[PDB]
Design an enzyme around this catalytic site. Structure first.
Site, short mmCIF file in Angstrom:
data_model
loop_
_atom_site.label_atom_id
_atom_site.label_comp_id
_atom_site.label_asym_id
_atom_site.label_seq_id
_atom_site.Cartn_x
_atom_site.Cartn_y
_atom_site.Cartn_z
CB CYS C 165 -0.97 -0.01 1.19
SG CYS C 165 -0.27 0.28 2.83
CG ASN C 375 -5.27 2.13 1.26
OD1 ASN C 375 -6.24 2.54 1.89
ND2 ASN C 375 -4.99 0.84 1.12
CB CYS C 377 -7.56 -1.36 0.49
SG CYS C 377 -6.59 -2.51 -0.51
CD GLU C 379 -6.02 -0.35 4.48
OE1 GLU C 379 -6.58 -0.44 3.36
OE2 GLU C 379 -4.81 -0.58 4.65
N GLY C 577 -7.71 -10.10 1.72
CA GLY C 577 -8.34 -10.88 0.67
C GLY C 577 -8.12 -12.38 0.73
#
Ligand SMILES: Nc1ncnc2c1ncn2[C@@H]1O[C@H](COP(=O)(O)OP(=O)(O)OP(=O)(O)O)[C@@H](O)[C@H]1O
Ligand SMILES: Nc1ncnc2c1ncn2[C@@H]1O[C@H](COP(=O)(O)OP(=O)(O)OP(=O)(O)O)[C@@H](O)[C@H]1O
Ligand SMILES: Cc1cn([C@H]2C[C@H](O)[C@@H](COP(=O)(O)OP(=O)(O)OP(=O)(O)O)O2)c(=O)[nH]c1=O
Ligand SMILES: [Mg+2]
Ligand SMILES: [Mg+2]
Ligand SMILES: [Mn+2]
Ligand SMILES: [Mn+2]
Ligand SMILES: [Mn+2]
Ligand SMILES: [Mn+2]
EC number: 1.17.4.1
Lengths: 289, 683, 683, 289
Positions: C165, C375, C377, C379, C577
């Site tokens: 990330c 980011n 995702c 978070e 994931g």
């Protein structure tokens, strides 16, 4: 040079009214003012009435007089879309948004309206004047057809596209966008058939056909300006609609192989958001000189 | 419609069966007595004009501060004393629409032709009033024309860069690819056309640190460069133009070519990046013998030999590549690849064809590097060394990225004034000044190559205009004799000026000692062969001018050996697209596309006759498409033998001819020594 | 069809009206009796295995050289003493298909689960055999799971970076845009997901060097970034993933959003570039009051105020921007924009929603910078400072680019072992080690921010699994009570470990003194509100573990004041994931999407029931789509009140609900303090 | 009482020949005797001619004279199917199985074949004899159309069905079955329109209309016998096909509301075996909780 290509594009664009669920439009329809609802109804009826003429007369009459099996098939397909798909789609939109009595009254009003009638009868007059084995009269009707498909519909399309670009009446706007996409290709195709006739003419006859096309465009355009003010002044949009009419008039002329008539203008961004050489192998001794 | 527009359209209205060419002149008068004089901004004197242009950030004050105002006034008076008149409406229209300085809102004209020429001359002279007057006389006589960047931007505060073309070498690394994208965007922001050599990049299906079939090949870099050029599009004024060059022995050469196929998918098709193919003599030999060829994976060759595939001679290393099991290769049909090239050029005019061996058999700086690719117009052919752009916080190994300044001699005006020598020397001085004042802060290899190579490009325009206005057919042997003599004179005086600059500055270009100029090899054909005209008509055309003989060339060779040469490269013949209109000249040394060209501006249409077109020289102004391309190749080779860089050679084809005819023309060009082929324009 | 696949597909075959869940266990046995053991490379002893892996460039020599072979053997023996067995077929399949080390030919298995865990533990401990054994016990108990980059690549020579990330700030310049493209390519090459903030970039139609209507806007930059991410795709293994964040008050916000519409043209739509929208409280206030909003041109604001639009508080700056004539703005309808966001999320799940004020009202490092974007995702929420990447041969001003270190606690395994404190502290130590061992030589701001901020992200997973296996509905108030208590303890022990590391090393993160940790404000809600469970069931769940009280929080606040805090950020809940499969856990703190998920691998079908799913807890394993999104928002806000960074919060919608329902969920999330909304997955 | 259900059935039956991959027939085609291939090509060419005229002329002209927008939409759709779908599908089959010269030759053969020219002359003559507002001329053309749909196609359909039933040429056969499925509903629909007109007449007029229908059927039948013998004698099937066309003649009569005319016979059992999300605006109450 072009009929099989247009055949392909036409049949791959096939669609049916049932594919778009209309009921969710009532969630934005209820929030429009009376003038907005009135304009929308009137525009919709205008499009419906003009498209019926194209389905019952315009496309079938051209299919009748054009020679060529493949052209007749494409033209038949286009006539089918007018009568079987577009007409049912307009009816569906109406039945969703208005009660039966309101629909009947709007159609009574638009049927009596001077500016809608003027353009509808001008176009129909040219279709009725086609004579067997006379390519000049056929060309004039094709010009009328291109003007309907690529120009006259657009004073009407403006409003659904305007809502569609704002997130309002999205289901009916999707339907209108599919209809408009069909009319665009219809206009281009009939335009190519008209250019074929035009190119078979003498230079004097060509100049005469150009004068016909420009004169017709002028008559229709001046009536469109009046039609536009009549419908759109009450919602404050007429200035921008006029720019959209001229832009589409230029497209119609280009479909007929003619130069644009109007200067280039930018269009309302909300409406915009809504919208071989012969291969011959080397034979050797071509490397030696 | 404007009055001048009607007068210009009156040319095609025939009177007594003849075109009304003189009406064109009337148009210019109208264009000046109704538009230019009314739209021009006049001041009380030159002082107020210069002050207004300086304080309003139109002009740079530094170059004007090197002269007292009396000297600037004298230069402007020298410019206006010629009483220059545009002989055609399109010349004045093109100048005042593309090159004359306008206000911020572009409602008025601040610069006349004389004003622009005076400003460019004052910038060129760098404080020398007499040199500024010499430049003024050279440009107002239209003997020399600075390139569009230089002519348009010289002495302007809001200017871009004066360099037209940039050539970048891209090393096989992600850091180098990203740096190439950055430099391409920076140079397109500066307005210059950027050419990138992608032959060092490893092909598709190569290994990135031991994981195989990982690389996207040159097509991914091509897409990145295409998006970079789309983004950097001269602030939305001129579409960003880029060129990608790939060696024909690269494995991706087919995919490369597939970027220009009209049926290519969107994930492969590239539309704003021109493509060029570099063909060594080995490929032509393989195609001639019909022996199946092999395209190579660059990374395997680099791993095995330590050098890039395009870094060494394929004519001597192709068999070693093929017989080496550690080198990866794919079988191709060279004749099928040639036919694909011809078909692609027929369909879209791409790729550019660069005959590498034709370039490098006469290249004077092979010691520095061989010429591996060309520019966006396929006329710049110079040595380039690839740069090693390393990781951040690591020092980069800066190589040499090609960049030269363009300037064209007007052949008709140069020969009418009998001033080949003076025009060539003054143009060389102006191009040297443009190179010296060029400093690009975001392209390090370009900056280093500009500082070291000192390469300039001195082109020529109005070859066909001069030949047709003198009753010489462009395809005739007399025309080729004239081109031979004229360009030998141009080369002689360019070499003389380069050596004189080296003597006066005490410095040569970097690595000159290993060049063929230093060893005297370059002058071989000039000290043994006489290039004086073989026809009496051409000799009469050259009367009043001292044509250099073998003795003059021997003296020049001795002078170069004693003093060296300031410029690594001096002569390159650019297309000269729009600035040829202002000079009333035919574009470059190419034959005219049409006698009268109909161009649509706004809602109006204008007709530009070729300069000097009339009834008596109508058939001497033969259209290029009607000409035999073999004789045009002969002309271009005759000129090329005296040009150290290349010539933007556009092929003019008829629709009736096949791809086999295009391949035959390409192979005859390769046979005749043509270095590069620019375009395949089909009528 | 293999035997284990038949045994797995036998789950759906119902016996006595019940799913044969236990059959899955048998499948695992088959998957190990038939496939895993047959294709697992075995060695005579661990010394031979380690020598083979090191010599064949599988492992790194440096991390193994820090231990004697006896210590490594003891760590491996500790890993194997657990006799860990995968409870479901999909866990073992996902590990041995995604994370287990395979030979170069990808046909043999070199690493078992215990081998990989031992290697990761030895890498974490950095020479401490006892610490390595503690890590082995942590990971073999499956209490803590390093992220996919760390778990897959730790101790491997052929590896990407352990961080995936990355958040980049892009300054409003061509140099900065090119550098951002380069850094995105370099980080995608390392295998990381790259998020870029495009709010500082000036909108379309802005001035470049005082020429009007020149900027292409952020959409051209998005096209460039999309091409860069397509090119850099982990050496052709995974599709290059990138995210772009734009403030909702940026004028390009519509065109930005228009990049995700299906009707968008090929020159408008970006396919591999995720988009996120940052929504300040001012936009929500304007939409709530139905007042028409203004989207501003960033460059005009920068010229007027000297700071970027996203660098100042829009709540106090919006009126001044609107009333400033020198700030250019366009009228928009904020409610129409919200409806457009909801419609786009319904169609494609884009954009991500960042509630700027929700993030920044609890942000501890607002002095360094306010969190401007998230980011890929959605978070990671950290302070970032833009970098000024200047021209060549000119020193760049390196800022802070976010790159946090991921790792997830398994809530079920952590709480059944009554080891919240030990697991949190060991995970913090491992994340600190991975952050310290990360050195990126092509991302200067990422490296500088990693060295300075020392930010890590400690997440949690198996929340819904733990709640369902304990007879607690995810939407129940008891579930929120448990989440509150558990994540307050996680925050307490994370802060305690950060302060202990700061005390041991004698250093805090850069600019810690200005943080709310230093001033004690961060602990305010912790020294006044007791977060002990309010339900007896949750208290019995926490039995055997000390729950930090207000006095404990006061002691921790004093400890942080005396010693500082080593990490600027500690906790962020990533989606987790594929590691959730290997750990036999539900993904992140999200509710389960399906009770049994059907997947297609190759030409075979496979069935994964949620962990611990049976007839007794079938009702408690409620699917996410069937749940009330308001209660999911309530749970995520309850967790977020104890997480310094954000939580990857995916909305789970039915096809029946309209864009009004989506907008209502978004507005309730904004009201409840939700920092980010990740995805709108429609069933 | 029926148009809407025919509209729905027609549009739900929509198809394109490209949906069926034809390269699978390549081998069973290669394996047929020269006589069999010749008869097959000619049979499909005869069908192509019939659909060409049904699409170009028959369906559009009937559409023109039938009142009601929905009836016209059905007839327009059927017209499109004839020339844009059916007639074109035969070319897809030809282009797969046969070289260009054989294709050119078979189209030349339709132009010079006397039975095919006679049947086209008779059917198209009746279409072109329709007089506006003259229901009797319209009835006569509708009888002709039913005879084309439900009788005349069947001398052609026999052979693809005969092969399909033996597991030969099954992809081409799939196309033919789709065409046949369409013609069956086209024949019923036009039959119902014809019955409407017939039912308006006096008993005396009805008696004359039955005479017209039966005389026309017999004339077409006698010509079809000669056509059938000409095509099928070389493959040994003429008697079998004759039984099939009589069977279908009875179906055509029934579509017209008339009693069967030919006696029942056993048909070859092989041939029998051959047979966006919804959008609501945001209320001010959605911003408060
Ligand atoms: N072809 C042309 N090229 C350039 N400038 C021109 C041209 N025609 C006219 N002008 C400009 O417009 C002015 C109009 O003057 P014109 O050429 O008609 O003759 P004039 O008034 O007798 O003076 P003069 O020719 O000496 O300038 C010129 O002085 C010149 O500045
Ligand atoms: N569910 C499982 N998860 C992980 N590994 C398994 C699993 N089932 C079998 N194995 C692997 O296969 C081996 C055989 O295990 P099995 O169930 O036959 O009995 P065991 O007593 O565990 O055997 P062993 O002597 O190998 O320890 C295990 O040691 C382990 O390596
Ligand atoms: C990173 C990357 C590289 N490449 C190609 C393009 C470059 O020309 C080529 C070299 O990349 P490099 O940047 O040189 O990669 P590397 O140095 O880590 O690998 P090596 O040691 O083998 O040089 O790889 C891709 O095609 N896609 C990618 O994502
Ligand atoms: Mg490398
Ligand atoms: Mg800047
Ligand atoms: Mn229509
Ligand atoms: Mn139409
Ligand atoms: Mn049919
Ligand atoms: Mn039919």
């Amino acid at each position: 040079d072009f009929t099989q290509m247009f055949y392909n594009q036409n049949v791959k664009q096939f669609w049916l009214p049932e594919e778009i669920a209309l009921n969710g439009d009532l969630l934005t329809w209820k929030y429009l003012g009376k003038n907005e609802q009135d304009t929308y109804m009137k525009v919709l009826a205008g499009l419906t009435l003009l498209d019926t003429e194209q389905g019952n007369t315009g496309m079938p009459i051209v299919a009748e007089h054009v020679d060529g099996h493949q052209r007749k098939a494409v033209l038949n397909f286009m006539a089918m879309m007018e009568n079987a798909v577009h007409a049912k789609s307009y009816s569906n939109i109406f039945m969703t948004l208005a009660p039966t009595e309101t629909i009947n009254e709007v159609f009574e009003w638009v049927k009596q309206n001077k500016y809608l009638q003027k353009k509808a009868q001008m176009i129909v007059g040219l279709y009725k004047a086609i004579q067997k084995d006379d390519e000049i009269s056929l060309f004039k009707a094709m010009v009328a057809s291109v003007y309907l498909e690529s120009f006259l519909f657009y004073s009407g399309f403006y409003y659904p596209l305007y809502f569609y670009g704002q997130g309002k009446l999205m289901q009916s706007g999707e339907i209108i966008n599919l209809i408009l996409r069909d009319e665009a290709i219809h206009g281009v195709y009939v335009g190519l058939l008209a250019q074929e006739i035009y190119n078979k003419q003498t230079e004097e006859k060509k100049a005469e056909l150009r004068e016909f096309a420009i004169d017709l465009l002028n008559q229709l355009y001046e009536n469109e300006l009046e039609y536009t003010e009549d419908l759109y002044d009450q919602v404050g949009l007429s200035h921008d609609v006029k720019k959209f009419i001229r832009y589409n008039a230029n497209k119609a002329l280009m479909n007929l192989g003619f130069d644009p008539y109007f200067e280039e203008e930018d269009i309302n961004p909300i409406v915009l958001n809504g919208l071989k050489a012969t291969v011959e192998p080397l034979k050797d001794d071509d490397f030696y000189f | 419609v404007p009055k001048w527009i009607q007068l210009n359209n009156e040319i095609m209205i025939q009177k007594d069966g003849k075109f009304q060419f003189d009406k064109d002149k009337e148009a210019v008068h109208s264009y000046f007595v109704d538009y230019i004089n009314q739209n021009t901004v006049f001041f009380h004197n030159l002082k107020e004009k210069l002050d207004y242009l300086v304080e309003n950030q139109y002009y740079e004050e530094e170059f004007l501060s090197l002269y007292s105002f009396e000297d600037i006034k004298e230069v402007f008076k020298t410019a206006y004393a010629k009483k220059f008149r545009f002989p055609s409406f399109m010349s004045a229209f093109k100048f005042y629409n593309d090159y004359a300085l306008k206000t911020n809102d572009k409602k008025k004209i601040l610069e006349r032709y004389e004003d622009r020429i005076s400003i460019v001359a004052l910038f060129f002279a760098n404080g020398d009033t007499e040199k500024a007057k010499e430049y003024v006389n050279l440009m107002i006589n239209q003997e020399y024309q600075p390139s569009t960047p230089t002519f348009l931007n010289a002495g302007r505060k809001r200017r871009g860069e004066l360099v037209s073309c940039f050539l970048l070498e891209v090393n096989d690394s992600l850091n180098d690819i990203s740096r190439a994208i950055d430099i391409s965007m920076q140079l397109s922001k500066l307005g210059g056309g950027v050419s990138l050599n992608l032959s060092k990049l490893r092909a598709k299906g190569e290994a990135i640190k031991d994981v195989e079939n990982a690389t996207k090949g040159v097509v991914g870099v091509m897409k990145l460069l295409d998006n970079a050029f789309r983004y950097a599009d001269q602030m939305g004024q001129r579409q960003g133009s880029g060129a990608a060059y790939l060696n024909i022995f690269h494995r991706d050469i087919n995919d490369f070519l597939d970027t220009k196929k009209i049926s290519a998918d969107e994930d492969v098709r590239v539309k704003t990046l021109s493509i060029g193919v570099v063909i060594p003599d080995k490929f032509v030999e393989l195609a001639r013998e019909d022996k199946a060829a092999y395209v190579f994976y660059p990374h395997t060759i680099y791993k095995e030999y330590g050098q890039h595939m395009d870094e060494m001679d394929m004519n001597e290393m192709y068999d070693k590549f093929v017989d080496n099991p550690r080198v990866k290769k794919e079988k191709i049909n060279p004749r099928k690849l040639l036919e694909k090239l011809a078909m692609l050029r027929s369909e879209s005019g791409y790729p550019y064809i660069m005959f590498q061996d034709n370039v490098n058999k006469v290249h004077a700086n092979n010691h520095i590097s061989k010429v591996k690719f060309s520019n966006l117009c396929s006329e710049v052919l110079q040595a380039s060394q690839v740069s090693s752009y390393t990781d951040y916080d690591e020092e980069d190994e800066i190589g040499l990225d090609i960049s030269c300044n363009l300037g064209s001699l007007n052949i008709l005006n140069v020969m009418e004034h009998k001033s080949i020598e003076k025009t060539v020397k003054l143009a060389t001085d102006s191009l040297t000044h443009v190179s010296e004042t060029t400093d690009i802060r975001n392209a390090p290899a370009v900056r280093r190559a500009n500082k070291a190579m000192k390469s300039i490009g001195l082109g020529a325009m109005n070859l066909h205009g001069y030949l047709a206005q003198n009753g010489i057919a462009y395809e005739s042997p007399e025309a080729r004799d004239f081109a031979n003599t004229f360009f030998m004179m141009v080369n002689f005086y360019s070499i003389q000026r380069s050596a004189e600059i080296a003597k006066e500055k005490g410095e040569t270009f970097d690595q000159y000692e290993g060049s063929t100029y230093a060893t005297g090899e370059y002058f071989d054909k000039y000290v043994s062969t006489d290039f004086s005209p073989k026809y009496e008509k051409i000799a009469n055309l050259f009367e009043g001018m001292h044509i250099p003989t073998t003795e003059d060339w021997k003296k020049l060779k001795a002078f170069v050996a004693e003093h060296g040469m300031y410029h690594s490269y001096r002569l390159c013949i650019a297309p000269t697209g729009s600035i040829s209109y202002v000079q009333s000249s035919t574009a470059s040394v190419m034959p005219i596309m049409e006698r009268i060209e109909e161009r649509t501006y706004g809602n109006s249409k204008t007709y530009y006759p070729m300069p000097g077109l009339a009834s008596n020289n109508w058939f001497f102004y033969k259209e290029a498409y009607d000409m035999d391309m073999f004789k045009v190749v002969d002309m271009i080779a005759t000129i090329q033998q005296h040009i150290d860089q290349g010539i933007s050679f556009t092929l003019f084809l008829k629709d009736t001819m096949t791809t086999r005819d295009l391949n035959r023309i390409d192979l005859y060009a390769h046979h005749r020594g043509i270095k590069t082929i620019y375009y395949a324009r089909t009528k």
